[PDB]
Structure formats: C-alpha cells, structure tokens
C-alpha cells in the first residue's frame, strides 16, 4: 500500500532503538598465544588453546 | 526598474518563527505550518483571556463556601446575609482573609447570622 502522511522523525527514532551493534568485549589472552583473541577460535598466528595449529 | 524580494520575507518569517519557539514538530520549524499554528494560538489567546475572569470568580467562591460551612452557613444563605445586614462590600478576592485569619472571617459570619436571625 502507501503511507497516508509523512511519519514523524520521532516515530522514526523510536523504530531505530534496536539497531545498534553488540560490543564484542569478551576477548581473552592465552599463555603461548601472545594474542588477545576471540573465544573458541584460532589466533592470527595459529594458536588454539596453547596448541600451535597451521604447524606440525 | 526591477525588484529582488527575499530580504523582508525572511525577516517576517523569522518574526513568525521566533514566536513559534517552544512547540512540537513542524510547528517549531516549518513556515507554512507555523503561520497557521501561531494565528490559531492568537485566537485562543484572545478567547481564554475572557475565561480567566470566569475561573477566578469560581475559585474564590469555592473557598468561601467551604469556610462558610465550617461556621455553619451555606454560600447562598451566607451572601444574602452579608447583603441584608449593612450591605457589606467585603469581597470574593478579599475573602482570602478567610484563608489567612479564621476569626476575622468569623466576624463576617457573625454579622451574616445577625442578618438571618
């Protein structure tokens, strides 16, 4: 269909209240990782849980 | 011999937009809408200026009828007493003396009863 009036900028702003993203936050470090990294993921170097992966 | 407008238009519009401060939405912003709302507000501003006189007389009667029924006399019978003894010109705004001093208003009720008795 269509609008019957221009809705207000206030009504527009009230729609947007859920829009903003989540602060990722929970980024931790490990002993031989040397890196602050996301949980349950390999580091950029190759560390997972103090195992070196992408290596022998 | 041309002309180039503009300058007195926006000054007039800033005259309107200044008076349009403190509204909501377009009414505080948009010229076509503000020009309607400000004129309509002026209509209410004239009309309500009469109704001010209505309100204040009623609210003075309100406190008089209350203070009168404590000393024990309803407002219609009370006011008729103040007229019928000595045609007293103590008054509706003046009866704030009733709020401030009770025994003063008691003297008014005393001579109101002195009419009625």
């Amino acid at each position: 269909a269509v609008q019957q009036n221009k809705p207000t900028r206030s009504k527009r702003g009230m729609r947007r209240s859920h829009d903003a993203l989540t602060a990722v936050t929970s980024l931790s470090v490990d002993k031989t990782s040397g890196e602050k990294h996301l949980r349950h993921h390999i580091t950029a170097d190759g560390y997972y849980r103090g195992r070196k992966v992408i290596a022998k | 011999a041309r002309v180039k407008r503009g300058v007195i238009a926006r000054a007039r519009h800033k005259k309107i937009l200044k008076q349009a401060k403190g509204y909501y939405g377009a009414r505080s912003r948009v010229y076509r809408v503000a020009f309607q709302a400000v004129i309509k507000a002026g209509q209410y501003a004239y009309r309500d200026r009469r109704q001010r006189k209505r309100q204040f007389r009623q609210l003075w009667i309100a406190r008089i009828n209350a203070a009168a029924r404590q000393n024990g006399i309803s407002y219609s019978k009370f006011i008729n007493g103040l007229k019928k003894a000595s045609v007293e010109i103590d008054r509706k705004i003046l009866a704030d003396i009733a709020v401030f001093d009770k025994v003063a208003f008691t003297a008014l009720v005393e001579k109101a009863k002195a009419a009625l008795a």
């Binding site: - | 004129i39 000595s86 007293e88 103590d90 705004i93 003396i97 001093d101 025994v103």
Partner: protein, 103 residues
C-alpha cells in the same frame, strides 16, 4: 497590621511596607496617595465596616509614576471567511509603597 481598600476599578488586601500596583492617577511622581476608602483595619484583630468605609481609617502611600505596561497582541481571525486583524495595547499603571494603616 493590615487593611483592605477600594482604588479605581477594584479592591486590594494591603499591609504596611508592602508595594502594590495601581491605576494611572493624577498624583505627582513620588507623592503620596490617600485612601479614606477603606473597608477594614486590623491590628491582627479586626475593626471592620458597618456600612461601607471605616470611620477613622486612612492609608497614606507614596507612588512611583511608571508609564506604559507590557504589550499584548489582540488577534481577530475567522476561518474560511477571509478576515483577520491584529491590534496592540500597553495600558498605563503606577505602583505605590505603603506607609498607611492609620486611625
């Protein structure tokens, strides 16, 4: 002490050392206005009127002349009928500082 009195147009509730607004009178700029027109005098205890105007009472009160009061925009408008007009008014008022309540 306190009293009540009638000016031009209407009455007022007045104590000494108070300052109150009045009508444009013909009294000089700082001069004193005299109300013999007074409805009750009270020392914190009442001596009211019988008939209008108390026998002994008088209220002596100095004036400040002032001039023209605040602007009001009087707006006449009819809808769908092509008529509109604006008019202004200032009025004229004086104040008075009260030295009276004498009997």
């Amino acid at each position: 002490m306190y009293a009540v009195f009638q000016s031009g147009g209407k009455q007022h509730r007045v104590s000494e050392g108070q300052t109150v607004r009045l009508e444009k009178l013909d009294i000089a700029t700082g001069e004193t206005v005299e109300f013999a027109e007074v409805l009750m005098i009270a020392n914190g205890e009442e001596v009211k009127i019988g008939v209008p105007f108390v026998d002994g009472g008088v209220i002596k009160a100095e004036v400040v002349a002032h001039g023209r009061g605040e602007k009001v925009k009087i707006v006449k408008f009819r809808r769908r009928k092509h008529y509109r007009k604006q008019q202004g008014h200032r009025q004229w008022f004086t104040d008075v500082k009260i030295t009276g309540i004498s009997a």
